[PDB]
Design an enzyme around this catalytic site. Sequence first.
Site, PDB file in Angstrom:
ATOM      1  N   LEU F  38       0.829  -1.195   0.000  1.00 54.81           N
ATOM      2  CA  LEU F  38       0.000   0.000   0.000  1.00 54.81           C
ATOM      3  C   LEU F  38       0.867   1.250   0.000  1.00 54.81           C
ATOM      4  CD1 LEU F  38      -3.059  -0.432  -0.088  1.00 54.81           C
ATOM      5  CD2 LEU F  38      -2.101  -2.282   1.341  1.00 54.81           C
ATOM      6  N   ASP F  39       0.242   2.402   0.212  1.00 56.73           N
ATOM      7  CA  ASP F  39       0.914   3.690   0.210  1.00 56.73           C
ATOM      8  C   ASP F  39       0.757   4.344   1.576  1.00 56.73           C
ATOM      9  OD1 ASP F  39       2.261   5.975  -0.530  1.00 56.73           O
ATOM     10  OD2 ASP F  39       0.828   6.617  -2.060  1.00 56.73           O
ATOM     11  N   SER F  40       1.620   5.331   1.838  1.00 58.72           N
ATOM     12  CA  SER F  40       1.391   6.243   2.949  1.00 58.72           C
ATOM     13  C   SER F  40       0.104   7.025   2.755  1.00 58.72           C
ATOM     14  CB  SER F  40       2.579   7.190   3.108  1.00 58.72           C
ATOM     15  OG  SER F  40       2.719   8.047   1.990  1.00 58.72           O
TER      16      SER F  40
END
Lengths: 114, 156, 287, 176, 208, 80
Positions: F38-40
Amino acid sequence: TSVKPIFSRDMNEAKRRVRELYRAWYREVPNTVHLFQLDISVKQGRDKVREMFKKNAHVTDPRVVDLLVIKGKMELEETINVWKQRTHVMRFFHETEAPRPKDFLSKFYVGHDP
Amino acid sequence: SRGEYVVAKLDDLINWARRSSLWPMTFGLACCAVEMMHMAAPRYDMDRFGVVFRASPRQSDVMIVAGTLTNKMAPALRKVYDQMPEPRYVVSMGSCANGGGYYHYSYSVVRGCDRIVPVDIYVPGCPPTAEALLYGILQLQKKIKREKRLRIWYRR
Amino acid sequence: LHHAVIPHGKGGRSSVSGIVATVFGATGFLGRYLVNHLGRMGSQVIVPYRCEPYDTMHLRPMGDLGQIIFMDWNGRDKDSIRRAVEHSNVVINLVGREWETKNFDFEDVFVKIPQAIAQVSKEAGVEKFIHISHLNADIKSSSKYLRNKAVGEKEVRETFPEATIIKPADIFGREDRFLNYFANIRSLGKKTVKQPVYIVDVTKGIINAIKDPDARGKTFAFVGPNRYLLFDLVQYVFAVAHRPRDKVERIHTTDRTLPHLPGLEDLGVQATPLELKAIEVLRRHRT
Amino acid sequence: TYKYVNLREPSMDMKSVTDRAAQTLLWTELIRGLGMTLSYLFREPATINYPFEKGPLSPRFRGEHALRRYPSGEERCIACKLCEAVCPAQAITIEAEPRADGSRRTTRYDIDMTKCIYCGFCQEACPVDAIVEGPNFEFSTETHEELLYNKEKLLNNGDKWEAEIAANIQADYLYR
Amino acid sequence: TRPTVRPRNDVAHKQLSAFGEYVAEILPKYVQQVQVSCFSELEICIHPDGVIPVLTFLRDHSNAQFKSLADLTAVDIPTRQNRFEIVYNLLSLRFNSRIRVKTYTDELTPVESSVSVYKAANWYEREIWDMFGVFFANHPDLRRILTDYGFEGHPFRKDFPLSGYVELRYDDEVKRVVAEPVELAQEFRKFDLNSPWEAFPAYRQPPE
Amino acid sequence: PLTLEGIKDRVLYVLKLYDKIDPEKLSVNSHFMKDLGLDSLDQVEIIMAMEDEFGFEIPDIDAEKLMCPQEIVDYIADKK
Ligand SMILES: NC(=O)C1=CN([C@@H]2O[C@H](COP(=O)(O)OP(=O)(O)OC[C@H]3O[C@@H](n4cnc5c(N)ncnc54)[C@H](OP(=O)(O)O)[C@@H]3O)[C@@H](O)[C@H]2O)C=CC1
Ligand code: SF4
Ligand code: SF4
Ligand code: SF4
């Protein structure tokens, strides 16, 4: 080379202020799609918001990231106020093509797009 | 044939009724609005032609678009335009509004109001003289004389 | 071929494209969206109107500077139609009225109009003529309207061989007839299958066919991506709208698929469902 | 030198305060305003019945954009492109070729009547006085196609009248 | 000489020369150029880290009052490490003299935002932000005035071309006014007019 | 009803409610940034989802200091 940056000192405050601004945009979009009587589902709007965040991803300098935070903050304020109109929010999207792809073949039939 | 006779008399009567009053609004952004207020002068009247400037966009017959139509103006313009009944007519007054004009090559100036609204009467000038504008309103009235809506309705 | 016909760069707003398009009708609905998509493409559009100039005044400024052009025509003679096809690259037959009048029934619009224009189009040298029709308009019963469209399809198939006969199903949009009739009623329901297709998918398919060669002669029919129950559709329309006679036979009777002939994805345009656009377009409920 | 306004005081004499009290309780100055407006009622209004009585003007008006020609002769322009160089919205467009004689002439001479802002710079600039701002101001045009004048439009618009234009130029060639 | 040549008065020239050397004596921390033109108006060219001290000085001190503010434009000169120039333009009320504080800046580093000491500077500052991009730190209100709300680009740069990237038109497909890339009707033919032969001899820069 | 297990179950079904996560895959050391892809951006989406469901206002520097679903559970069990 004497430079006084805007807000940050390194990219740590940059990441902090940009994640706060993304939180603000994430909770500000469904209010606008209720208010402006739009035609767009909520997750499509949220995906194009995160698309607009992902577009500017290749920026390294702290001053430029802080200035983008300033730009996004100004436009989020003008969208939580009712000072903008339906034209402007649809202007952020693209439901009027602009259909030209990135194919070399289509850029060969349609003239002169290197 | 006398059905066509009575229909022709009725259509010419209702078109004369539309030719008579012609309640405008005064939208009027830039100095062409000053020339509108000077065709509201004591010299060139409006009341001889039934023309009465009326602030309501709801009871406007014609709409004089004048001044420099800009991008920051445009949604307010057509949002004015929609709240207006199905017989409606547009006079584009002045060189800015009828084709861009002097601010033609700039950001944030719409190159003529064809991009926004349909245009019935173009009148050029900068400002078009009140004498000339009143002649433009007479040729508007003669366009209203040529309509035959009810004749086309009967032969529909 | 001749100059000022070759394309030029980008599209739209006096970016000249190849076609010179003569569109019949167009004061109504589908011709109006087609004129709008041609002005977005940016070509010269000849429209004849028999009607008042004021209706085409309100559907006028979508063309750019001197792009669209007006003339007058009727359904009696050939001189104005020949004047319309003096110089025309492509030409489309989009004609029709859904209720009989004094001067014209369902007969002789669908009979008298396409004969003369197909004759003078094959004579006066046009290319890629496109004729709309309704879906499943056959010789079968309960619709003088649909059997007359079958008669017109027979004529347009027989004379002028190199056409594109096309047919959509019941289409919905901002000025739709039958969906507004659903909203403006007063009411009962049966089992009847029906596929509706949104109007811009149809007109993207039409303009793709009008600019695409080497797919001509093949007749087309358009496909709704859901194709579900009439009474569920009336429930969904009343649900999104917050509230609890030849036309009524046409809507009640039948709307089926025909696997004989190609459709959307055989031309390459994405279909859009009813529900998304119906949330988009169903305004004008209470408050 | 300065002459300021609003520096009086209310005189506390009985006469001044009863005059101001009469002004208040007796509506006198409002009646004075009505008297002034009726004094302009019984005048004769300076209107003109328009399509029969056109307005006054000057002999130096800027209207129609006509072209001229030599006495019993051909066109007066040269295509020297000064008017396209001085047109402050660049509505002038000149494409020039010489014809079968050898004398220099044109092919295409265009004014955008939309972009024309009616300065008179092409009236002051033209050395042969070929383009003249015309005299009359009645354009009143239905479509946007008509308002893009051609050279043959300007020649047939200069052939529609010159006697007006020649009389006005002979009236006012000495100033400009 | 005597007819049709606008005569200069050396009295204002000498008095503004003395006043300029006086200012350069009493604020040595920030002064770079004090130049006087032939039409006798003072031009003080200043580093952008003394804007607040110089204006707080020049508003008072009873040798030069200068209450009145005017034009602020940050006139964009390229071929410099610092592109933009903030031009404050100050006017007295007792003395009838005009001084131009030209302080320099770049595209990114903020000037000190004079709105705390000159109340007129608020919308002037908002205008310079909306047209150029000179950010103003410690300033209360930065919004967009004179441009559209969906607009960006800071159009009065030299790097923003004369036409726009967006252009509006109405379309009935979505029943609204939408933005499209520019498709002009005419070229705006730009004429080369930088004619040679050096029309002014006194302004010849030193060549190499 | 304020037990550790009701809190962990409600965090788990709001993770199941979240759309981009694949598969369910609960762990005590899951670390949904780069172990789960995932991403920040999606990190702070999840954190504001928690904040909007049942918790406090949940500041951003502590939101960087979680990066793990079990540590999120420990944060709610810490602060609530
Ligand atoms: N679901 C649908 O809506 C379907 C539509 N179509 C076709 O789509 C088109 C548009 O649909 P719709 O709105 O229902 O039809 P319209 O009536 O709106 O469009 C037809 C146009 O042609 C004009 N016209 C038709 N017959 C004549 C005639 N005899 N003389 C003069 N003018 C005539 C109409 O009226 P006027 O003369 O006043 O301009 C109108 O301008 C039609 O061609 C129809 O056949 C086909 C199948 C399905
Ligand atoms: S056309 Fe001339 S008078 Fe009219 S608004 Fe423009 S500049 Fe003013
Ligand atoms: S300035 Fe006069 S002579 Fe020269 S091109 Fe124009 S009209 Fe012709
Ligand atoms: S008067 Fe018109 S044509 Fe002549 S220079 Fe001015 S704008 Fe151009």
